[PDB]
Amino acid sequence: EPLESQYQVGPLLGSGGFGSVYSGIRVSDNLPVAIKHVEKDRISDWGELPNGTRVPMEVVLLKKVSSGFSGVIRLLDWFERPDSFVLILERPEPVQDLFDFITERGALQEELARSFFWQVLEAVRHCHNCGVLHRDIKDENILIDLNRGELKLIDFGSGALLKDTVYTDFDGTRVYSPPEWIRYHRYHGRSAAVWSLGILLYDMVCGDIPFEHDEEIIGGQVFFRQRVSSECQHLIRWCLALRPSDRPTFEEIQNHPWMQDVLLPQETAEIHLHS
Numbered sequence: 001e002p003l004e005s006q007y008q009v010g011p012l013l014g015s016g017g018f019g020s021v022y023s024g025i026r027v028s029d030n031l032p033v034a035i036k037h038v039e040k041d042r043i044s045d046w047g048e049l050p051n052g053t054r055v056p057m058e059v060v061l062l063k064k065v066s067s068g069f070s071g072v073i074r075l076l077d078w079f080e081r082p083d084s085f086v087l088i089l090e091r092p093e094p095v096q097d098l099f100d101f102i103t104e105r106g107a108l109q110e111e112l113a114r115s116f117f118w119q120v121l122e123a124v125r126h127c128h129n130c131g132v133l134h135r136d137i138k139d140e141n142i143l144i145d146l147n148r149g150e151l152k153l154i155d156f157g158s159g160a161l162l163k164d165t166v167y168t169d170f171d172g173t174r175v176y177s178p179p180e181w182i183r184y185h186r187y188h189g190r191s192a193a194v195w196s197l198g199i200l201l202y203d204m205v206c207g208d209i210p211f212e213h214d215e216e217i218i219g220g221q222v223f224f225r226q227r228v229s230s231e232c233q234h235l236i237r238w239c240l241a242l243r244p245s246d247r248p249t250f251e252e253i254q255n256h257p258w259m260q261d262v263l264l265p266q267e268t269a270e271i272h273l274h275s
């Protein structure tokens, strides 16, 4: 029953809006885990389990996406404390988050960006198929398993149940948010997710995000400061179309000429990561 007997807690990995995240190991089988604490007072979006138990919405969303194998970090267990919730999540080892990876290594070769972007797309499709919208897709919320070449999506703390009607709330990362949110405080889930995927793809191939200020986001003029292929540029510009209805569907992204002949995760690691 006690989390403290069930888990050996290691160092703090970081903290922020998502709470405080620690490295841990599951005592029974030495499974590497991440242990995430959030103060109850600090929780904005609440949900409830089938049994009517009151939980953070994050737990509800995680349960929906954690069935079977996927490119999403799975929730293994969770605990309620008097003043907080503690979530036990998978932890890849060895691992590096994609923000850190890009910061250290610079712009990614297109072959590598293709492999990573494809995997992110498959993970996002998985979320949507499970009825969950992440709402904070960005480099820092993607973990790279450096040995397996697998990417894993993290931090559902800004997410929502996926719906076909308009969203009028948002607490994700502003520089990845779409022009319709900035201008009108309104967006739809899939088309907003595609915008954020455009920002991410640009970040991968350029080594930095395309827009900093609101006026740039709504201007949507995409300038490339690095050499990027015409097909890649086309896909980015399409994802970053100003009118949400002008953006590609997930099918249209994965059928784009830039996205053909993707490497497998293992070969991605052998070529680009082992070192």
Ligand SMILES: [Cl-]
Residues within 6 Å of the ligand: 018, 019, 020, 037, 038, 039, 042
């Ligand atoms: Cl917290």
